Write a protein that binds this DNA or RNA. Structure first.
Ligand SMILES: Cc1nn(C2=[SH]c3ccccc3N2)c(O)c1[C@@H]1OC(=O)c2ccccc21
Ligand SMILES: [Zn+2]
Length: 357
DNA sequence: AAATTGCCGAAGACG
DNA sequence: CGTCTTCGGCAATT
């Protein structure tokens, strides 16, 4: 029954080839444009992130996430209040004379001027794309992405996300995050945390304004690794290993949410990352590969559902990397919303998920 | 050195 | 299920 639904969600290869071909051609053009003398954003390198590159994209290959990461040495972080996720950026010492001073505001490296330039360049370059139908969607407070809209003729969107790369140790609000010791283990956790961390120009919302110079932590790269390396056994989902249902559960919970979001705008606050964050916790709670045996798909999905209902009910979903940061705090998602989603989920759960049709 | 090449895992397609 | 395929990712090579 859930097998059937998964069959429908599964991406068709033909559809992937036509989408990738177009998406890739456009990104390499923008990446290439981004280099090339002049621009502040030279040494940017590409990192593909997102449901698609984690292989958990459903229904259609019509959403692509791309990080344009920039290595910036000698930066100091100041925690924006006690958010844990948001920061101000300064430099160790004076530039002499170097690219990113035209994004400063005194000593602070403002996310907003840096993003506005980045968007301006992307816009001038999309202007010149003649063989493909692509446009830049209008700006949005609360998003760090310059979003492309591609009609292939199918509608495809590409979020191009500027990122600052920092090679130093992770900020201490992450010190007790990534709790994978009993699952992926201590050597993996330590190795993961020796990788760089990234900041993206999503501004912290103070009230109903946005604090324009703040940046947000991003662990898209880390999350991408974990999806490709998700078992306690090294052979999970390999040719000489056992298939598990972890990813299948993530897709099912994704589908469920996205359907409810379609016909209910009481849910615009919710999103996929909530479901992703939740399943990460499930994977920590149930680290054994044997617990996610495909035979057990139904009970694994329902356990995920029960856990997600419990997060809603108790108004608490800890960020997986930054345990201070409550994604289900009253300030980000109002109580009323959380109860509405709870009743809809509970409804589908007890009625054999009619919305799956 | 910016662009090509080689290698192979993840997973779709098909019987 | 096995096998064959395309795509993504990576870094050695020119
Ligand atoms: C609510 C939400 N949070 N969210 C976060 S919170 C956060 C904290 C630290 C790092 C990433 C991050 N993403 C996120 O990606 C979302 C959804 O993804 C979005 O880009 C977005 C946009 C509007 C509503 C919800 C989301
Ligand atoms: Zn697995």
């Amino acid at each position: 029954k859930l097998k059937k639904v998964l069959d429908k969600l599964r991406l068709k290869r033909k559809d992937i080839s036509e989408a990738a071909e177009t998406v890739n051609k456009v990104v390499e053009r923008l990446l290439r444009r981004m280099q090339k003398r002049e621009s502040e954003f030279k040494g940017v390198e590409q990192l593909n992130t997102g449901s698609y590159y984690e292989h958990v994209k459903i229904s259609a290959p019509n959403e692509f996430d791309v990080m344009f990461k920039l290595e910036v040495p000698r930066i100091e972080l100041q925690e924006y209040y006690e958010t844990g996720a948001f920061y101000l950026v300064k430099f160790k010492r004076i530039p002499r004379g170097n690219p990113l001073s035209h994004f400063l505001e005194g000593e602070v490296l403002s996310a907003t001027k840096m993003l506005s330039k980045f968007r301006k360049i992307i816009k001038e370059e999309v202007k010149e794309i003649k063989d493909i139908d692509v446009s830049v969607e209008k700006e949005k407070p609360g998003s760090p992405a310059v979003t492309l809209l591609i009609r292939n003729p199918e509608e495809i969107s590409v979020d191009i996300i500027l990122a600052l790369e920092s090679k130093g140790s992770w900020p201490i609000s992450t010190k007790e995050g990534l709790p994978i010791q009993g699952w992926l283990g201590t050597k993996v956790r330590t190795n993961l945390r020796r990788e760089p961390f990234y900041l993206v120009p999503k501004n912290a919302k103070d009230g109903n304004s946005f604090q324009g110079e703040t940046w947000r932590l991003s662990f898209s790269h880390t999350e991408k690794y974990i999806l490709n390396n998700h078992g306690i056994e090294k052979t999970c989902c390999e040719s000489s290993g056992a298939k598990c249902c972890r990813k299948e559960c993530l897709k099912l919970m994704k589908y469920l949410l996205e359907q409810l979001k379609k016909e209910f705008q009481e849910l615009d606050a919710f999103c996929s990352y909530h479901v992703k964050t939740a399943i990460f916790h499930m994977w920590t709670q149930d680290p054994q590969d044997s617990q996610w045996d495909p035979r057990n798909l139904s009970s694994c999905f329902d356990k995920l559902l029960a856990f997600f209902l419990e997060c809603l009910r108790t108004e608490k979903l800890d960020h997986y990397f930054i345990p201070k940061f409550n994604l289900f705090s009253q300030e980000l998602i109002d109580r009323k919303s959380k109860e509405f989603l709870s009743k809809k989920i509970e409804y589908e759960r007890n009625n054999g998920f009619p919305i799956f049709d």
